[PDB]
Amino acid sequence: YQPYRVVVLSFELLHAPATVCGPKKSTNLVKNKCVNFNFNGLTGTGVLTESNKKFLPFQQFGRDIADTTDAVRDPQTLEILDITPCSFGGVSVITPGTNTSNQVAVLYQDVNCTEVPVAIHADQLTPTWRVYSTGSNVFQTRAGCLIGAEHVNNSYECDIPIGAGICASYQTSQSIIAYTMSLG
Amino acid sequence: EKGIYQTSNFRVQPTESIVRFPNITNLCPFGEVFNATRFASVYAWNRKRISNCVADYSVLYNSASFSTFKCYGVSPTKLNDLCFTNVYADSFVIRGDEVRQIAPGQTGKIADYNYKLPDDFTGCVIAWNSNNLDSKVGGNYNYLYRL
Amino acid sequence: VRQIAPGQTGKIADYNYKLPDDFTGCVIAWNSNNLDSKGNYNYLYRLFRKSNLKPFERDISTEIYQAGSTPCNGVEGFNCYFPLQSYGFQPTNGVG
Amino acid sequence: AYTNSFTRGVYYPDKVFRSSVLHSTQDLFLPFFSNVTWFHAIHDNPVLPFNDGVYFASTEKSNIIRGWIFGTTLDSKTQSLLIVNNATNVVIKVCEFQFCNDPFLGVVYSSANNCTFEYVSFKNLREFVFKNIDGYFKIYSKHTPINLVRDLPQGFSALEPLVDLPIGINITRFQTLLALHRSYLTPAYYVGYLQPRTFLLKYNENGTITDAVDCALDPLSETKCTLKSFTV
Amino acid sequence: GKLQDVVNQNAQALNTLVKQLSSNFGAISSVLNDILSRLDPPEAEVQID
Numbered sequence A: 001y002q003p004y005r006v007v008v009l010s011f012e013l014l015h016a017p018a019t020v021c022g023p024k025k026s027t028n029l030v031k032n033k034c035v036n037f038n039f040n041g042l043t044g045t046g047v048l049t050e051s052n053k054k055f056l057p058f059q060q061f062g063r064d065i066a067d068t069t070d071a072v073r074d075p076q077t078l079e080i081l082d083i084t085p086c087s088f089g090g091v092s093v094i095t096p097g098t099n100t101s102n103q104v105a106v107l108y109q110d111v112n113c114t115e116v117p118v119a120i121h122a123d124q125l126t127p128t129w130r131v132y133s134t135g136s137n138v139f140q141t142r143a144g145c146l147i148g149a150e151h152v153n154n155s156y157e158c159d160i161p162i163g164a165g166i167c168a169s170y171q172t173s174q175s176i177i178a179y180t181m182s183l184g
Numbered sequence B: 001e002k003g004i005y006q007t008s009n010f011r012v013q014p015t016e017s018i019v020r021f022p023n024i025t026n027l028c029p030f031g032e033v034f035n036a037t038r039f040a041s042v043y044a045w046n047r048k049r050i051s052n053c054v055a056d057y058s059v060l061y062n063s064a065s066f067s068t069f070k071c072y073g074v075s076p077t078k079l080n081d082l083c084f085t086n087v088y089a090d091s092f093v094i095r096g097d098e099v100r101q102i103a104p105g106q107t108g109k110i111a112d113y114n115y116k117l118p119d120d121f122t123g124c125v126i127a128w129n130s131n132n133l134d135s136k137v138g139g140n141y142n143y144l145y146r147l
Numbered sequence C: 001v002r003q004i005a006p007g008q009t010g011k012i013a014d015y016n017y018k019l020p021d022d023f024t025g026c027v028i029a030w031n032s033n034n035l036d037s038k039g040n041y042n043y044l045y046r047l048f049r050k051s052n053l054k055p056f057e058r059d060i061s062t063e064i065y066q067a068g069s070t071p072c073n074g075v076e077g078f079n080c081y082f083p084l085q086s087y088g089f090q091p092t093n094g095v096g
Numbered sequence D: 001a002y003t004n005s006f007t008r009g010v011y012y013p014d015k016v017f018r019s020s021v022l023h024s025t026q027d028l029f030l031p032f033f034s035n036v037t038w039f040h041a042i043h044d045n046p047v048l049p050f051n052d053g054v055y056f057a058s059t060e061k062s063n064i065i066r067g068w069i070f071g072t073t074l075d076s077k078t079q080s081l082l083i084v085n086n087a088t089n090v091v092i093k094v095c096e097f098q099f100c101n102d103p104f105l106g107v108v109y110s111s112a113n114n115c116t117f118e119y120v121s122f123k124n125l126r127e128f129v130f131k132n133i134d135g136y137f138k139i140y141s142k143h144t145p146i147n148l149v150r151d152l153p154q155g156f157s158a159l160e161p162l163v164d165l166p167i168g169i170n171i172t173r174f175q176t177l178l179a180l181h182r183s184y185l186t187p188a189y190y191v192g193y194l195q196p197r198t199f200l201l202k203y204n205e206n207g208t209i210t211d212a213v214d215c216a217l218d219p220l221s222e223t224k225c226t227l228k229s230f231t232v
Numbered sequence E: 001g002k003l004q005d006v007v008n009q010n011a012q013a014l015n016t017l018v019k020q021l022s023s024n025f026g027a028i029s030s031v032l033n034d035i036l037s038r039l040d041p042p043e044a045e046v047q048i049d
């Protein structure tokens, strides 16, 4: 037999611009590493980096010739960041044939080679796969980075081509080498 | 056989998940409908039309103040990510036992005669008690229900 | 009975009984007003859960529901609730 | 009472930065070399239609024209829009207004009934584009200093966005608002119209639209539009 | 001109291939996430296909 203090709400979604809803949170931006981002609705995945472009003050993001997003404006500090993809490539296996031996060398294309143990999941791989991420046999070429072969200073004919003047063969006990090819 | 074979691909995986959004400025005026001076009776419940603001529902849900909170079609953790064109707000004065009929499908003294939630609902109810300051000594004949 | 289809949302399909998105079978439903109305209160269903159910998985617990920040231990106080709510079935209701 | 445009009414269609790129878009534009009605108020405020968008430009010198009425029926039954400059603030109001058949504001007149919301924020050629798509009202503008004889110039300059509004009215007609001295209550501006065209814009090294090509003006410009270049 | 045409033809073909990612082919959008954060899974698998 005591008074109450009631408040009752109800919503509508008749087809119109929605002018009322709740707050959308934020985190703090991190640069120079591969993240998933959400800049005001625009989603993606890449590496954020301080830029040189100057937008016009009403423009929110930039595009290139094939219409991909490659620059964005942060909506709190109004600066311009770059977008660059997280690195990818192919994995190629160099073998001398299984009628002869069983040791191989692995080429990782376009890596810079210090990123190899972390681009592959070398902590999560087999211990027989972890040999080909780190070692003494690490060689950086224009075609990528070659791990598992010995960079000699001779020159022979090409046996298994790699690219940009580099070949690889199985002679020398026996091992897998990597050399600049000779023309004659 | 002897050669070089392309067996797989690699890709560096993302580590974090950032979100960037503009500053939160234009709040909704809930102080006008939760800290008002005086209220109105049952049959003459006042309506408020709330539009064009950001509404913080977590401070209403976590208030340490009410006695009633129930709703249908929404949960109190979904309310911060779902949008509407218009939100209405009603508030009035009722008694102790006159509260449980405020739901879809009930009858009472004032449910089917003054104030009915229709066949389905979306919004939520919030109620507490008013004997702390809204009942003077010597009787209170200042708010008027329907018979 | 709308929510006993694959890929549904609500409270039956989210907290009580979840069908997988690849389902192979039949769903059979019929009106049973003449045996379940007296309103009966032995027909119970959950209201809150920490997350949604996996397909074909049960949950039987009356551990009470915390939603704010107070670690409520067996107390149905402010912002701490009991999951199981019951229907009310009588011929005073319309179909639905 | 008629003149043409020569290159006039090009705006930035979206908020995307592009540098040193020719880009082809399809949107509502005012066509090149087209007749605009000229309203010189010498002795002039009729009710013009709002078909799908309106161009507006004024060669003023002394702050006469202030704003616009929009809406459909003007009868304070359905909703209408209002824009007024009170020499310090740009007031935008969406209500059921009391409407004179010759309405103005003298050098003073407003209304309020049952309504939604409000928003508040001769070297003078001010250009405007009003557009009403999918529940949003859009306004683009630019001003530039001219001294030609009377009319619109021949140069090229693009119209930046000003404000977007979430209003949601069916808009059918509109008319202007001037400032005049005598309050005679009785109970130099141009108007174009937008068509669904296809243009070819040229962004320079800083993101500014520097030139455009109307891809249906003549057979030479359709060659520039398929080759995606400004030279053939 | 015979060597310039081989470079222009290969760049035209790679440009068309990347610009074909902005077409929706009958779906509601051309973005994978806006199909996913708008529809429920049993009929977001016909807009992805």
Ligand SMILES: *[C@@H]1O[C@H](CO)[C@@H](O[C@@H]2O[C@H](CO)[C@@H](O)[C@H](O)[C@H]2NC(C)=O)[C@H](O)[C@H]1NC(C)=O
Pocket: A075, A076, A077, B023
């Ligand atoms: C959004 O709000 C933040 C929080 O205040 C603003 O950040 C500050 O801006 C001032 C400029 O007036 C700087 O001096 C401060 O260093 C900023 N940081 C803090 C922690 O105060 C930010 O400018 C706002 N962004 C807008 C309005 O676009």
Ligand SMILES: *[C@@H]1O[C@H](CO)[C@@H](O[C@@H]2O[C@H](CO)[C@@H](O)[C@H](O)[C@H]2NC(C)=O)[C@H](O)[C@H]1NC(C)=O
Pocket: B030, B031, B034, B035
């Ligand atoms: C109604 O008004 C009271 C103040 O009389 C508000 O209570 C305070 O809210 C602030 C907001 O941060 C808290 O910091 C205080 O702890 C609250 N209590 C006191 C005693 O000051 C209350 O939030 C208002 N309710 C609304 C606006 O819905």
Ligand SMILES: *[C@@H]1O[C@H](CO)[C@@H](O)[C@H](O)[C@H]1NC(C)=O
Pocket: A099
């Ligand atoms: C290589 O393959 C041939 C094919 O039959 C086989 O006879 C021979 O044993 C293999 N091994 C050698 C030559 O070491």
Ligand SMILES: *[C@@H]1O[C@H](CO)[C@@H](O)[C@H](O)[C@H]1NC(C)=O
Pocket: A112
């Ligand atoms: C590869 O690593 C070297 C070592 O510092 C660095 O100088 C160079 O910029 C890197 N090249 C890249 C990232 O392309």
Ligand SMILES: *[C@@H]1O[C@H](CO)[C@@H](O)[C@H](O)[C@H]1NC(C)=O
Pocket: A151, A152, A153
């Ligand atoms: C190959 O020659 C280069 C040339 O300076 C030398 O630096 C390198 O040590 C040589 N590699 C050897 C000896 O393995």
Ligand SMILES: *[C@@H]1O[C@H](CO)[C@@H](O)[C@H](O)[C@H]1NC(C)=O
Pocket: D002, D035
């Ligand atoms: C446009 O103006 C020209 C010259 O004033 C006139 O000849 C023509 O009839 C007008 N109307 C159209 C539709 O071209």
Ligand SMILES: *[C@@H]1O[C@H](CO)[C@@H](O)[C@H](O)[C@H]1NC(C)=O
Pocket: D204, D205, D206
């Ligand atoms: C473009 O930007 C450059 C560099 O800031 C500036 O020098 C130039 O004035 C700008 N405008 C042009 C080229 O119209």
